[PDB]
Amino acid sequence: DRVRSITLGNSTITTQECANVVVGYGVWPTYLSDHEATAVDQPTQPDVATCRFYTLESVKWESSSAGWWWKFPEALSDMGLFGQNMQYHYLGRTGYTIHVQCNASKFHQGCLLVVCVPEAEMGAATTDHAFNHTKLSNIGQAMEFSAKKSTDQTGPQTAVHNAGMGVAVGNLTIFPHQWINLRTNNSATIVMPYINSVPMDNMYRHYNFTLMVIPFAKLEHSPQASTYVPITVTVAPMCAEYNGLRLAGHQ
Amino acid sequence: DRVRSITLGNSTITTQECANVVVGYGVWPTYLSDHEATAVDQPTQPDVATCRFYTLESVKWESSSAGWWWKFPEALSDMGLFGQNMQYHYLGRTGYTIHVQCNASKFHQGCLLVVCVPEAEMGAATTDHAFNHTKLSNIGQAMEFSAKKSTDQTGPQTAVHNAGMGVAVGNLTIFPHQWINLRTNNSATIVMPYINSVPMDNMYRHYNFTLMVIPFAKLEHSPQASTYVPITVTVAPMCAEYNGLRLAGHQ
Amino acid sequence: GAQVSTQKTGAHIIHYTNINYYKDSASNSLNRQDFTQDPSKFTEPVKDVMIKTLPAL
Amino acid sequence: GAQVSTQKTGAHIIHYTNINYYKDSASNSLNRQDFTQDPSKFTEPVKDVMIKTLPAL
Amino acid sequence: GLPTMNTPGSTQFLTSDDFQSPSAMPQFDVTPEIQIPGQVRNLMEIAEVDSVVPVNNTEGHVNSMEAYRIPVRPQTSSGEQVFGFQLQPGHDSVLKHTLLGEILNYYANWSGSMKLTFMYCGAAMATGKFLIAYSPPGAGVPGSRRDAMLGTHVIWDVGLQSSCVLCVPWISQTNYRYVTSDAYTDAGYITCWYQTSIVTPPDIPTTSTILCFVSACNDFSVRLLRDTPFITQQALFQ
Amino acid sequence: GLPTMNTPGSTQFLTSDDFQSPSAMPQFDVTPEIQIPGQVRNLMEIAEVDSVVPVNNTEGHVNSMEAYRIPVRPQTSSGEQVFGFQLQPGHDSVLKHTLLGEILNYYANWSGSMKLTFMYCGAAMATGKFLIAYSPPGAGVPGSRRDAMLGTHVIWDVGLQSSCVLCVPWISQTNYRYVTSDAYTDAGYITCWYQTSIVTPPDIPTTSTILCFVSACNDFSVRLLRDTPFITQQALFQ
Amino acid sequence: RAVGRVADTVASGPVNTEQIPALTAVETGHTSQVVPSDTMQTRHVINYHTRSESSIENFMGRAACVYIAQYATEKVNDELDRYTNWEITTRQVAQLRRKLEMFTYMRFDLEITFVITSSQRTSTTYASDSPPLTHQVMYVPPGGPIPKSYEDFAWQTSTNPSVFWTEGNAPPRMSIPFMSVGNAYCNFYDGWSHFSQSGVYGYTTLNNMGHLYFRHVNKSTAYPVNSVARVYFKPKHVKAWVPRAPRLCPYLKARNVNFNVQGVTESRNKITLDRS
Amino acid sequence: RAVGRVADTVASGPVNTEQIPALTAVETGHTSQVVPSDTMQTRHVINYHTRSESSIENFMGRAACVYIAQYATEKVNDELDRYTNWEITTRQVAQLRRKLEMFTYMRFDLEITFVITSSQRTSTTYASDSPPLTHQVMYVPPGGPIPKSYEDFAWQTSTNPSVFWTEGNAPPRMSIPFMSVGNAYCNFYDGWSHFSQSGVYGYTTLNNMGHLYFRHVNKSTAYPVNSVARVYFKPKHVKAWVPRAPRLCPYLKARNVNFNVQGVTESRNKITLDRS
Ligand SMILES: CCCCCCCCCCCCC/C=C/[C@H](O)[C@H](N)CO
Ligand SMILES: CCCCCCCCCCCCC/C=C/[C@H](O)[C@H](N)CO
């Protein structure tokens, strides 16, 4: 059906035109097992003060919009006690419930790919040059692609058809994805598990996955309709646990 | 015995001096099995509108006649609904009942080899030169050998003792054959199965077998007997099926 | 300690013998004959099941 | 997985052993000792049977 | 010792061998593997996933997102063509950089049926019918919608379900076609035509968008590994 | 390791070896074989098929169909010779390009009985008798029909059955004769003679035609593979 | 009686019968099954002969040279380049071609063996001291990236099958499975490549087996050295169908069956024999 | 049915149903499982094809050249020194790099094979007589004492693994187990080396595999000889996770994923086909 209700903590998401839920690689998020742990100290698990919904700022969708990306867990670095637990701990581990939402009308048209790319390591715009970390991702700001190539001396290559990774943008549909087609679809929800080659990791020096939102069919409508449609991203951590309590970081 | 009656569709062949029937390589024609098919769509099998007898034009047998050849399934390209099914389909598959008939008298003498050669790939008359397809076989015309060599700039090598294939003409008796000796034999019937290295094939870009009719002992008689003896070829497809319906070909 | 296994043959004297010579499993040959697969992690990773004949929405 | 077979000897200690070493059947040796045959596809491929002693016509 | 004899092929390096060899790190304790999600045991799990096809790749459109956007609009008369390409999933320019096309260029032979999915990305108030046809390669290209209605085809009614699947069947005389194309193993043509039109209410843009996706069916198989003719280098990357 | 020792013959290429060797395409999926008619498991199935003999090969007749046409006619006196050739089925010019003769030139030894079939291709109103004789090689060639009636022979009565078979028996002191001829393994002579005549009614042509066919019997065998002295090349075919 | 052993002949006496085994009809397409016991008096012979050498595996299972590839350690022209190639075919040599063309369709696995030999090119001096030469024979499947030069990236052979061989050792050898996209290798194809009956006539359109690239992996020599690599095909696990007539005429080209017209056999002066 | 064998198609007839297998929704993230039996009439085909060549072990298990190491018996400079080294990586060659980067995390054992070849350097004379050359390929784990020169004490290899090889014999080969300090080899790392999000961005911080030092263990030659050692990696016992999109753009560097912007595919002139 098209209705779905997601409740995590003291927060609820309701949707009246839901496509489905994409669950990761078929895996639900869970806590780390005893036969897979490496650290020996007892973890902390704030179950409802951290595994709740945190909404980000909306982005204005235009006809000439190329797309936006968010890098995680650095996108939620200041979102409540999820951000306070990142500062005080060396290791962390979590899965997510990403919920992207955009309604327009029955008189608008457009389509957005919503991919979750694990280890979306981006190249440089100006080559033979290392880039700054604040150009890759600010703390909650939506970093955005471009229609043509970037000549930034210290930034990523934001041409959208190469997706910043040197690949074809059409081949991103192996990563866990949905589509927001404005003809039929209102939102898009992806449940990501923890994907890493280590059981826990540091949540500052490593972007575990990157959420991209890309217009494949661009937004067009009559000039007498609503010219402003926003795209809001609401992300909930899931089964978040932490290790290595020390002073507040993060250098 | 010498009598035989072959009925296929709405057509009947009667013969009062039959030698025998040669059946292929000991195999009767049949439809393709499920464990040998490659194409997945349902075949069409017009059982009586295609697997009937189609007679060709007679050829005049003379004393100085070297022989004639017909290439199949291109010899029946316009013969009823067998020709209409070749145009509308990509693949086809069939076995044949070839019936060659020639009566003279008890006062004539001659002998004809009637071979069915699978993949009778012919060389060029003028070498270092590719030949035209209408010199290999027209649509129902009997292409004929020569007593001496051919100097055609775009034709096959039609010297009959080399049989167009660079081999000895005497060694063609490993291919399925009969003889029409006018002393004893009236007709000659060969049943060919489907011989190919693929289960179905295209019936335009490939001549599956070639029927040759070669005078080994030449026709001679008294001048006061009948100076005209013809050689008629009547061919029936058997278990013909088709695949790959599209528009009418054949380019 | 000989492992007799089935050789790779076609479809319409078919066995080989293997002895392991070294004390480390990284010294072994390739596992050529393991053709297991399950593509539902990628092609149909949705929460509710989607039957083909039924409408998707 | 040793196949002991009969060696090619004459007519008037006669066996060999074979171990297959590779995982592909195309890696095997030749099938030298297979002498089966049936020449009736070519020498007598007629529909009605023709007994020698009886007249052919 | 044991009397031995050396066959041809001794002291060679065949790069596709399978032999044992001694360890440089003896009794090395390898770290334990864990459950990482998304394990791949076959490249046919990757090729059976949809990947959007750049049908609109007439340059300059390949250097933007315009390459994926097949345009449709309301028509003045019906039966015109929307798009068309040859069914060469490893050689045609439309399909050889898709996710199914990139795996096939590591191989020399391919076999099986394919799935072309289409997605209407217009407004919810706009209706339409389309005919998507596959032609076996014998007669040539279809010249009209009358020529295309004679082969394998599907009529797609644009409604609440935005997507339709044209299943391209394996209709071949061989069990394998070649990835790099030739005339012996030609596979045919894919075309799309206006079955009716696009009919819209007022205050709606004219041009809409159709997205084409390719994937492999469950009878798809590849054969004869090779190097791909897509990556090159003139020197070692330093 | 295991203590070994290398015998003579190590690191050689004997072209008629039988050894295992590793695969360049590992785990290659070979396409399934189907039932194709006419499978050959032995070259003795090919050699047991009739093939018409060019007995009339006196040039210029080899460049036409006149090479196969043994001529007969009504005679003035009886007992004359029709044809004759030496029984060297791999060396004689009459029999070495026949279908039995071409297989034997791949081999150095042959053994077994042979079948010479004859076929009268005259008019149905013409009658005739013939004596076809085989002579063991000790005394020389037969000089007359009296000399030929002393060996293995058959009298053929031309009637409703147009064909007769002279069976040439294996009468040898060795179990194998040589394909390329020598004097130790000579096999003898085949001759044909008029037993009576050709008697015809009026209004019939004089000269008729006899066709000779050769094939091997079911006790025929070959031995010692070799290269055939029939195909040559001075350079690689480009 | 064992499989492959010829038949015994039985003892036959005199006859006076209405049976006629000698009289038959060639017009029926039937080869007569006459034994010497039917037309003359014979004795009982226990024949122990076998048809071992005449099997399709034994007739074909001997290695034959199929190509002679030449390449040097210094380029003269692009025929004596640093590297060379060969489109894989069985039609350039005449001995193996005539043996394969006795059948219409075959299906076999292969053994490829290389006999690589070098020789010092003619110069004004030869007195040098060179390390042993090592060669590479890379197979490129149909449609892969081919070496456009020496020092190419395509010789990295990450997915193509390669072999390496130093001079002095045993000849290199690998096994090849059955590689056709059909169900048999076609020795003959009576047809065209395009549907309009045009393009290429013959078996050339059914032979897409790829190339075989040769080089010296040594960078240089003091004085130039010419190498020759002979390619040896031995077919094994052989099936064959539809036996062809043997070829009379020699070959002219490798992609055609084109010939010059020749007589059916060699001649003699008369049709009889004339001694006593 | 065996494991790895493709599915048969079933015989389907005409339909007039309320079922709609052709109509679906791409917006759900779901790839439709449509068979040709659902949209047209098919026959029953017994498919015997197998997915053998497409396995991760078969796709990866072929040896690919990963480095070309050069060193001489007489120093020209420190690039043509007596000895050389190589930091072990898979990113300098493009064929193996594109195959590994189809996955995010892998876990395999290795086979390293060396094809070492020498050549006499260009001189005014070459006429000498030298004994066969012997080479050493010493592996140095991360943090060990490296050779600072020829004649070094660090070539005593008392605890480092070494191999010795005389020219003329078979190529040397050893096996390497899985060597990462994590649970998989990371082909990609989206992050930094320092906690302040600075330093080195990318997969370079997760590649500490050590060096591989090459030399001639012969002391001298009469005239100088240049050697080249090619390093061949074949991964075995391969696991792989999280399949990546294939790379469109060629590589520029070995420590980055930096690229130049290119179009998504090659072009054509129009979107239709225009013949009959
Ligand atoms: C450096 C390693 C070299 C590996 C060699 C691999 C080359 C072999 C692959 C192709 C095998 C083709 C076999 C040829 C068969 C004939 O063409 C058929 N009789 C005619 O169709
Ligand atoms: C002279 C004896 C030489 C012994 C050679 C030992 C060297 C091998 C030890 C390190 C093996 C590293 C394997 C490399 C894996 C790749 O880097 C991963 N795919 C990327 O993380």
Residue numbers in the entry:
A (entry chain B), B (entry chain B): 11 to 261
C (entry chain D), D (entry chain D): 2 to 13, 24 to 68
E (entry chain C), F (entry chain C): 1 to 238
G (entry chain A), H (entry chain A): 9 to 284
Q: What did the published study say regarding this structure?
A:
The genus Enterovirus within the Picornaviridae, a family of non-enveloped viruses with a positive single-stranded RNA genome, is comprised of more than 100 serotypes. Human enteroviruses (EV) are presently classified into four groups, Enterovirus A-D (EV-A, B, C, and D), among which EV-B, the largest group, consists of over 60 serotypes, including all 6 serotypes of coxsackievirus B (CVB1-6), coxsackievirus A9 (CVA9), over 30 serotypes of echoviruses and more than 20 newly identified enteroviruses. The capsid proteins (VP1, VP2, and VP3) adopt the classical eight-stranded anti-parallel β-barrel configuration with the N-termini residing inside and the C-termini exposed on the surface. Most of the uncoating receptors bind to the “canyon” sites of the viral particle, dislodging the “pocket factor” in VP1 and subsequently triggering conformational changes of the intact particle to release the genome, albeit that SCARB2 binds EV71 outside the canyon.
Here we report the structural characterizations of E30 E-particle, A-particle and mature virion, among which E-particle and mature virion are compact with fully ordered epitopes, showing the potential to be ideal vaccine candidates. We separated out two distinct types of particles by ultracentrifugation and characterized them using SDS-PAGE, single-stranded RNA detection and analytical ultracentrifugation as either 143S F-particles, containing RNA and a full complement of proteins VP1–VP4, or 80S E-particles containing VP0, VP1, and VP3. The three types of particles reveal a pseudo T = 3 symmetry arrangement and the overall structures of three particles resemble those of other EVs. Like other EVs, E30 contains the canyon-like depression and the hydrophobic pocket in VP1 harboring a pocket factor beneath the depression. Like most enteroviruses, E30 F-particle possesses the hydrophobic pocket in VP1 harboring a pocket factor, whereas both E- and A-particles lack hydrophobic pocket and harbor no pocket factor. However, compared with EV-As and EV-Cs, which have a continuous circular canyon around each five-fold mesa, in EV-Bs, there are, instead, five distinct ~15-Å deep depressions. A ridge between each depression is formed by the C-termini of VP1 and VP3. A number of key structural elements contributing to the canyon, including the VP1 BC loop (the north wall of the canyon), the VP2 EF loop (back part of the south wall) and significantly shortened VP1 GH loop (front part of the south wall) adopt different conformations and move toward the front, together with the ridges, ablating the back portion of the canyon. Superposition of the asymmetric units (protomers) verifies the similarity in capsid structures of the F- and E-particles (RMSD = 0.4 Å in Cα atoms).
